[PDB]
Amino acid sequence: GAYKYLEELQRKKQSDVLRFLQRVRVWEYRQKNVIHRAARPTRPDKARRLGYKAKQGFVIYRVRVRRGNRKRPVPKGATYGKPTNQGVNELKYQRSLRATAEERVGRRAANLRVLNSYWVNQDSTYKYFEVILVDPQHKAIRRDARYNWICDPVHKHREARGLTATGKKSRGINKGHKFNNTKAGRRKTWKRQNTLSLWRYRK
Amino acid sequence: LSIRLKVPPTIAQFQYTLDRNTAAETFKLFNKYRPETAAEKKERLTKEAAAVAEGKSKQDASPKPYAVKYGLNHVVALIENKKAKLVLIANDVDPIELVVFLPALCKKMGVPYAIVKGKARLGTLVNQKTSAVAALTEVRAEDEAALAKLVSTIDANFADKYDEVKKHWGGGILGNKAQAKMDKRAKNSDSA
Amino acid sequence: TVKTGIAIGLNKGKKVTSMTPAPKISYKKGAASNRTKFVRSLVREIAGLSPYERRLIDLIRNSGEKRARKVAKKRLGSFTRAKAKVEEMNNIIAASRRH
Amino acid sequence: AISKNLPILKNHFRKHWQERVKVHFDQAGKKVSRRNARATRAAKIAPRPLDLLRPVVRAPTVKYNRKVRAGRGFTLAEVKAAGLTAAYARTIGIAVDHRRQNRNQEIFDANVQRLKEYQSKIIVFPRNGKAPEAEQVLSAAATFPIAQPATDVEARAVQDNGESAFRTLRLARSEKKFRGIREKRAREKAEAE
RNA sequence: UUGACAUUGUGAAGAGACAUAGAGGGUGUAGAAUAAGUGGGAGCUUCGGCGCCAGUGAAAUACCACUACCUUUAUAGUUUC
RNA sequence: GUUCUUUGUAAAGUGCCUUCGAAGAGUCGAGUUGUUUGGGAAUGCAGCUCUAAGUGGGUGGUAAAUUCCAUCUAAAGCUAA
RNA sequence: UUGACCUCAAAUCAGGUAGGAGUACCCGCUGAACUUAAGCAUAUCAAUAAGCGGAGGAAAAGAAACCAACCGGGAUUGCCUUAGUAACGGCGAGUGAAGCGGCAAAAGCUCAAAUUUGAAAUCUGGUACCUUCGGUGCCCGAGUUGUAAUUUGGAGAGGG
């Protein structure tokens, strides 16, 4: 309703008036741990258009990880082959540190069902992506009125899916030229299309 | 927020409180105006079964429910239609982002907003737990003089302090052990 | 654009006698109204401006309208937004120190 | 080392296509099965024809001529100017398109007319049971073939009054290009106040 | 191992060198002189001042320029102190 | 093909005129680095600084800018054969 | 000198949930060597072998910020064709996608962005009753930081 005024609010948090409030936002995010218990959402605008109902189910988590890349536990470079392929620190990851906010609390989500996710505040050491979950074994969810697909075996448990809301956040898998790469997947988008299908009735 | 260091110019109203001399008559004024509870409304439906349902009189043979206005972070029709009078502010306010634009929804339209602290007791006269504002558009003649009188009080204690507050920041509040050495240092530095 | 009706050469297309009814439903996202210019005249006036734009409002009028645009150009990342953001600042200054 | 004057093969050879080649030895397998589902799962299950009357749409581009293609519906504008609504067409069997409409005149004067030879040929059975059977047809897609409308016949008299063509189209292509060149100097000449 | 921005607020902050332009001194022997290594000597508003005015003599005093700048100020500001 | 019930002064859909037209908030774009690919001077994925608009933005296999037109309505989910 | 709301906790109860094997096919993330090589790096092999986790009973993808410059186009994948010409590679060995046409299989839908304001109508839990992949009544909690009904880019909502 009155979320139209919240739409304008974007860079006002960094302006010379609410810039002090920016630290107050990331304040509680670091004071708490990784896995804990939360209550009512802090942002009624974002945690709403992803699926909302004033009852007992829609919550907002608070996961805290590092900020950067990843280095594989190899004995100071167990690889070491080609000078271009080499570089244990040059291997600055490639394709996953965004679902991380769910990929670890997915064990805490395997017993539930992740709805969507978003962002609130960050620094230069940690990451804070608040994720909303919905309990699928809850009778209020199994019935309700709108949603009637939660009962059916549908979801992939958004922590090993790769097709999360934070995963479909990117992943251009449309139909155009910029979407012909991962249109099928990784193997079938190459192993299959490059296969000379030879029937019985050969030419 | 408004105890330790500086305060944001967009707010600077949490340090200001209302006296118990005016707030007393304010709470008692909203006492007579409250919707019926769930325990005294569902049973009432069985009483009007032979007057409204079988009586064929939708909202005809029923007294006017003079209910006080309300709404905080969800106000749309009370601005475009100019139906906002007495406006109150919440106490705790967990969303920090949902308080920096509350006085702006009354200053632009010239709506007499009142900086008050509390919404829990006013949540009892609305059959809930938390409340918000309490304006009156269709008030009776019983409390007509008890409503216009408070208008001149709010406008001379809240409406006159907005532009001046917005300019200045706000601070100078003493801390704790910090002022037990800092203030004692300047005393010996000037006149030992 | 006056088609040819025959083989290609000068014009492009065919003489289509369309009835040109109702097109799409979202050509003009912005307009006058009393709500679109009600939020910015209530929310934007609170915070005012941003720290990186408080310096750009002292380069357009002072250092002319050439190099000042280049400063905001690299500040954003493109020049396509130098007429949708910088141009908007012309109405901000006039609604501040002027009025 | 050197293949001399021979066409060097650059296909999927060097790779391990020993177990990669997905051979398909079906065709007739899924044939009969689907046909056992066309005479049962489509005939003795929900007594309705599969291939309904598809909208005769054309296949453009100069690369292909005298072609013929089908669609997914008759839009909403064609249904509105037919006789019934859009929501009512979803109950009968009339195909309805989506996400947009059409603006062409030839399209409107081809699909709407065809619906007149379909809607007036069938009726609507009541929802209160009954609904007698009068031997229906399980083929509405390939019932009324529509080819390309021929213009004038092969008996046109000799008409000429300055054809040129080869000289006209040559200057037409030049005029298409030389637009921001000829008019460029002309605009800078008429501005001489 | 090193550096800028951001993470990370605030401007009451001791002392310098700059990003466009107009004065200030150019003093070694002799010539009462500011003749600064080199170039330019028929000239710019023309009624009028100096055009090469005197003694001395390697260089002689308006004139769009490669120029080393002893010491200041300077409009919206200033990467590291 | 039958028997047994009144949902309902109800619900849904369609036409014309006046007053109108909301659209997700560190997301898109751009720049640097790594990996991958068929895409030719930045296609997809991951991380970081700067950092979007309301008569708007983006794409349509060759970057950018000025004067016109123009296949869409994303950053959310579910969905037979 | 004395009672409430929000946030943060603690059991062995009615009513629920979590930790894996097999695993064709398929999907997300991370990550090698050998063969060929007019010496070596780039590149090919290879968005690979092996290994791990989750979901489904087909999976991924897909009902348009897509594909065209024509006779405007009518959802995804796969077989045939487009298609071995361009591109990428010490232009060497190699890798090599998509659009038009044609064929088989079709019926599509909805949250926030939106206050009934002159009667908190729906959903969850417990008891009783009953026709138990459910319904009615009474008594709580969640719920003024606004739920529910209506509506989905093809327009839709609010009046006469």
* Domains along the sequence of chain A with CATH: 1-203 (3.40.1120.10)
Query: Which nucleotides of chain E are near protein (any atom < 7 Å from a CB)?
Result: 6-10, 75-77
DSSP B90-153: -SS-S-TTSSTTSTHHHHTTT--B------SGGGGGGTSS-------SS--STTSHHHHHHHHH
Q: Which two tokens stand for residue C8?
A: 């290609």
Q: What is the CATH number of the domain that holds B137?
A: 3.30.1330.30
State whether residue A22 is helix, strand or coil: helix
Is any Cβ of chain B less than 8 angstroms from the Cβ of C45?
yes
Q: Which residue is nearest to nucleotide G143 (CA to C1')?
A: A54
State whether residue A126 is helix, strand or coil: strand
* Structural domain range at position D118: 21-126
Q: Name the CA radius of gyration of chain C, rounded.
A: 22
Q: What is the CATH number of the domain that holds C28?
A: 1.10.10.1760
- Cβ of D35 near strand G (under 7 Å)? The reply is no
Domain annotation covers residue C83: yes
What technique was this entry resolved by? cryo-EM
**Element at D91 (helix H, strand E):** helix D86-92
Alpha carbon distance D65, A182 (integer Å)? 35
Alpha carbon distance A45, A50 (integer Å)? 10
CA of C35 to C1' of E38 (A): 77
Alpha carbon distance B154, B160 (integer Å)? 9
Domain annotation covers residue B183: no
Give the CA dihedral A40, A44, A49, A53, nearest 10 degrees.
40
Distance from CA of B104 to the nearest CA of C (A): 6
Domain annotation covers residue C44: yes
Is any Cβ of chain C less than 8 angstroms from the Cβ of A139?
no
CA of D189 to C1' of G98 (A): 48
Number of domains in chain B: 1
Among the listed residues B177, B154, B187, B179, the one whose alpha carbon sits nearest the alpha carbon of residue B84: B154
Backbone φ, ψ for residue A133 (5° rounding) = -115, 155
* Structural domain range at position B51: 1-175
Domain annotation covers residue B187: no
DSSP A55-104: SSS------EEESS------TT-S---STTT--TTT----S-SSTHHHHS
Partners of residue C46 in chain B, C-beta under 8 Å: 10, 100-101, 104
Largest interatomic CA distance in chain D: 87
* Structural domain range at position C45: 16-99
A residues 16-75 lying closer than 8 A (beta carbon) to C: 16-19
Contact check, Cβ <8 Å, A197/D21: yes
Instruction: Report resolution in angstroms.
Output: 9.5
Alpha-carbon separation of residue D98 from A111, D54, D72 (angstroms): 39, 15, 8
Contact check, Cβ <8 Å, C51/A12: no
Asked whether D and A share 3 or more beta-carbon pairs under 8 angstroms, the answer is: yes
Asked whether the beta carbons of A18 and B99 are under 8 A apart, the reply is no
Partners of residue D27 in chain A, C-beta under 8 Å: 199-200
Q: Name the CA radius of gyration of chain B, rounded.
A: 23
Domain annotation covers residue C55: yes
Instruction: Return the residues preceding each gap in chain B, C–N over 2.5 A, or none.
Output: none
Alpha carbon distance D119, A185 (integer Å)? 45
Which own/partner contact pairs does C33-42 have at CB distance under 8 Å and 24+ positions apart?
C34/B80, C35/A4, C35/B80, C39/A4, C39/A5, C39/A7, C39/A8, C40/A8, C41/B108, C42/A5, C42/B101, C42/B104, C42/B105, C42/B108
Contact check, Cβ <8 Å, C46/B108: no
* Residue given tokens 């910015």 in the structure block: C40
Domain annotation covers residue C97: yes
